[PDB]
Amino acid sequence: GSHMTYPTNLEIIGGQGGSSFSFTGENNGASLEKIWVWVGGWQIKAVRAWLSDGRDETFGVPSGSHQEYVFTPGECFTSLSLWGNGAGTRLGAIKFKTNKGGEFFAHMTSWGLKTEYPMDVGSGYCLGIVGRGGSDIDCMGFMFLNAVQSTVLTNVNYPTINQLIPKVATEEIKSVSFENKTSVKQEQKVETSKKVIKTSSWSMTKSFSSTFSVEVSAGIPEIAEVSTGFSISFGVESTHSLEQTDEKNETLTTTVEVPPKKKVDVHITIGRASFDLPYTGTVKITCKNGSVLQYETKGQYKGVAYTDIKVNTVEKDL
Amino acid sequence: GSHMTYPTNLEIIGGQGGSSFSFTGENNGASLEKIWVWVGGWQIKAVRAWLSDGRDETFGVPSGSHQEYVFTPGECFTSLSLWGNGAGTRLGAIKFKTNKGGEFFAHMTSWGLKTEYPMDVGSGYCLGIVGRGGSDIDCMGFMFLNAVQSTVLTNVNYPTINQLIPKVATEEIKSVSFENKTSVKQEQKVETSKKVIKTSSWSMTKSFSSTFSVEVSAGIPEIAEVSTGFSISFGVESTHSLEQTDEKNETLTTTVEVPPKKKVDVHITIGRASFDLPYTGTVKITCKNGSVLQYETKGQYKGVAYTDIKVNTVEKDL
Ligand SMILES: [Cl-]
Ligand SMILES: [Cl-]
């Protein structure tokens, strides 16, 4: 009496004839983006579906006009019912509603509807359609991702990071000169403060990111100024949000020595690095029921990072 | 002995004549937003200054044309020098540069410049001007906030919060129905997941928030559904950013009882509240040197908040 759970929820309605089809984003997390439905007197006649990855297929043989539903990013099912044709030989009707308040109802036109089969839409995120068809839709179901516990982008790599040439803009913070006209040493304390706004973002298809809160477990590109010049490093792995911004007052206290009968110019700056480079990773979806769906992904990472505050001191005679 | 530090940095250059003036944001964190400078042969003739709170005053008596600098929000000084008029009786010249690459130089037109006095601009955030004036600018300095360790909005209150009538939008998550044709109750499990995006923002003058990272120590308005309806509460105090957004997968697992000979409709929803209400607080600036500047402030809070997921069931015979 062991029990198996799955990351998808699929209930197929209709008859036993025709040829099998499966048209879903189980491979890559694509969702149903658009659907056209044709009907006949005693069946759903045909269905054409588009997934968010651009796939486009037709099942059954269209006749007459079609009805359309176009899903916008983030627009999930809230409810779905299917009917057979009452004879156990075809799909008869499709009714659904969405979280944007849309409704869609397509049905056979001669025979009345009998038993309604209301479906659990899981998370509401529809991965596509599975069934059998020939001339008509013999049977079909809508496949949903089950309710999710977590959605994580992990195993993140930046394949070009070690080829990247640092682009670092100088931001001026402050400059001041000191004078020592005596023949003794002087010291001057200089304190510095500067707001820095650090950002990270990993690109993802908007339909997926609109529906799910994606946690990122990744290192990010980092910038420092070192001996020969600027250096880019692949930082240590930590938890981020998909788009993240943090701000801080970065500060420094510097003691400048002023040697006798000399002028000392103090120049205080910081470097601002932009990052714009591709990444690879794995999307791991863990469902409430304990099952997992995962797939490889790629995108673009954009980040802003700052160096440490830098103090440059130049001596003159005077 | 003891050592005294101050939250402001001000070095006044010129002579001892004229009447004292003080035109600064010490009281309220206002910054120098615009300056006009008139010159004569042996003096800075007059200065008109605008602060970011709308204050506008003129010191000295204008003659001839003026030079202008207008500071955009976040544009801080990087450097400043002042000159007397050589005789030690008037201010003679003003030179500054900004973190946006601007430079301004106004000087007396006949007598030559002598000793340059380079200034420490502290944080770079200029609170205003202080000096003495009559016909001319006898002496003047630019007042700066010293380098900052932290800037915090605290003691936050929402004075209208207990008057507010909850306005809460329903977001549909999922609905499904079950039917029980038997003489014994049945149990259906339903899992729910729903992305929510929660936000907080406390308005502040853009010159200040562009220059300083303002941490917020505050409770926020919260929304909940109670037996009697929706309820707004003043949440517990915690750390926030001045503008904050967080996303989360809200989830729930529910056992639905289907009584004998009944159909049960299950409707799962969440409530979204959009707060837009005034706040009062205290801004506390702690400088690197240990001194503090604080003042009362007021503004508008905006935030999106959600209730818990709600499950509603309705029974019908059949
Ligand atoms: Cl049937
Ligand atoms: Cl002088």
> What does A251-303 look like in DSSP terms, one character per residue?
EEEEEEEE-TTEEEEEEEEEEEEEEEEEEEEEEEEEETTS-EEEEEEEEEEEE
SS3 label, residue B81: strand
Instruction: Find where tokens 């899981």 sit.
Output: A122
Enclosing H/E stretch for B210? helix B206-211
Strands B214-218 and B148-157: parallel
Q: How far apart are CA B3 and CA B290, in angstroms?
A: 11
Please identify, among A114, A147, A180, the residue that sits at the C-terminal boundary of a domain. A147
Please identify, among A132, A147, A162, the residue that sits at the C-terminal boundary of a domain. A147
Q: Kindly state whether residue A58 falls inside one of the protein's structural domains.
A: yes
What is the C-alpha radius of gyration for chain B, rounded to an integer number of angstroms?
A: 30
Instruction: Find where tokens 């059949």 sit.
Output: B318
> Within this chain, do residues B134 and B69 fall inside the same structural domain, yes or no?
yes
Q: Kindly state whether residue B2 falls inside one of the protein's structural domains.
A: no
SS3 label, residue A98: strand
Instruction: Mark yes or no for CB contact B78/A122 under 8 Å.
Output: no
Enclosing H/E stretch for A208? helix A206-211
> Within this chain, do residues B62 and B167 fall inside the same structural domain, yes or no?
no
Q: How far apart are CA B177 and CA B194, in angstroms?
A: 20
Q: Kindly state whether residue B215 falls inside one of the protein's structural domains.
A: yes
Query: Shortest Cα distance from B170 to chain A (angstroms)?
Result: 10
> Within this chain, do residues A177 and A309 fall inside the same structural domain, yes or no?
yes
* Angle at A244 (CA atoms; ends A241, A100), nearest 5 degrees: 65
Other residues' Cβ atoms within 10 Å of the Cβ of residue B313? 15
Q: How far apart are CA B305 and CA B158, in angstroms?
A: 16
> Within this chain, do residues B49 and B138 fall inside the same structural domain, yes or no?
yes
In sequence order, the β-bridge partners of residue B36 are B48, B68
Task: Please return the burial class of B169, using the count of CB atoms within 10 Å of its CB with bins 0-12, 13-18 and 19+.
Answer: exposed
Nominal resolution (angstroms)? 1.7
> Within this chain, do residues A260 and A236 fall inside the same structural domain, yes or no?
yes
Reference B194, options B266, B270, B256; nearest CA is B270
Burial B282-291 (b: 16+ CB within 10 A, else e): ebbbbbbbee
CA B261 from centroid of its chain's CA atoms:
61
The domain tally of chain B equals 2
> Within this chain, do residues A308 and A259 fall inside the same structural domain, yes or no?
yes
Strands A214-218 and A148-157: parallel
> Within this chain, do residues B136 and B68 fall inside the same structural domain, yes or no?
yes
Residue-number span of the structural domain to which B250 is assigned: 149-318
Q: Collect all residues of chain A within an 8 Å Cβ-Cβ radius of residue B142.
A: none
Instruction: Mark yes or no for CB contact B247/A241 under 8 Å.
Output: yes
Q: Is B122 on the interface with A (CB under 8 A)?
A: yes
> Within this chain, do residues B273 and B180 fall inside the same structural domain, yes or no?
yes
Token pair, residue A232, equals 């880019």
> Within this chain, do residues B163 and B246 fall inside the same structural domain, yes or no?
yes
Cβ-based neighbours of B28, under 8 Å, separated by 6 or more: B53, B295, B297
Other residues' Cβ atoms within 10 Å of the Cβ of residue B173? 24
Q: Kindly state whether residue A222 falls inside one of the protein's structural domains.
A: yes
Side chain identity at A30, as an amino acid letter?
A
What is the C-alpha radius of gyration for chain A, rounded to an integer number of angstroms?
A: 31
Q: CB contacts < 8 Å between A and B, how many?
A: 113
| Closest CB from A171, A193, A288 relative to B148 | A193
Token pair, residue A21, equals 């089809």
Instruction: Mark yes or no for CB contact B174/A79 under 8 Å.
Output: yes
Experimental technique for the deposited model: X-ray
Cβ-based neighbours of B72, under 8 Å, separated by 6 or more: B100
> Within this chain, do residues A138 and A168 fall inside the same structural domain, yes or no?
no
Q: How far apart are CA A139 and CA A133, in angstroms?
A: 7
Task: Tell me the residues surrounding ligand 2 (ion) with CB < 5 Å.
Answer: B 84, 88
Cβ-based neighbours of A121, under 8 Å, separated by 6 or more: A9, A76, A77, A78, A79, A80, A142, A144, B174, B176
Reference A57, options A68, A45, A49; nearest CA is A49
Reference A243, options A220, A272, A223; nearest CA is A220
Q: Are A233 and A212 in contact (CB under 8 A)?
A: no
Q: How far apart are CA A61 and CA A41, in angstroms?
A: 14
Q: Kindly state whether residue B163 falls inside one of the protein's structural domains.
A: yes
Reference A242, options A306, A153, A156, A150; nearest CA is A153
Q: Kindly state whether residue A1 falls inside one of the protein's structural domains.
A: no
> Within this chain, do residues A184 and A274 fall inside the same structural domain, yes or no?
yes
Q: How far apart are CA B86 and CA A77, in angstroms?
A: 80
CA A57 from centroid of its chain's CA atoms:
25
Q: Are A144 and A12 in contact (CB under 8 A)?
A: no
Question: Which ligand sits nearest to residue B85's alpha carbon?
Answer: 2
Side chain identity at B224, as an amino acid letter?
A
φ/ψ (deg, to 5) at B63: -145, 140
Q: Kindly state whether residue B1 falls inside one of the protein's structural domains.
A: no
Strands B292-306 and B262-287: antiparallel
SS3 label, residue B157: strand
> Backbone dihedral region of A60: left (phi > 0), alpha (psi from -120 to 50 degrees) or beta?
left
Q: How far apart are CA B77 and CA B71, in angstroms?
A: 9
Please identify, among B148, B163, B180, the residue that sits at the C-terminal boundary of a domain. B148
> Within this chain, do residues A240 and A138 fall inside the same structural domain, yes or no?
no
SS3 label, residue B238: strand
SS3 label, residue B56: strand
Q: Kindly state whether residue A2 falls inside one of the protein's structural domains.
A: no
Reference B135, options B45, B200, B221, B66; nearest CA is B45
Any idea how long chain B is?
A: 318
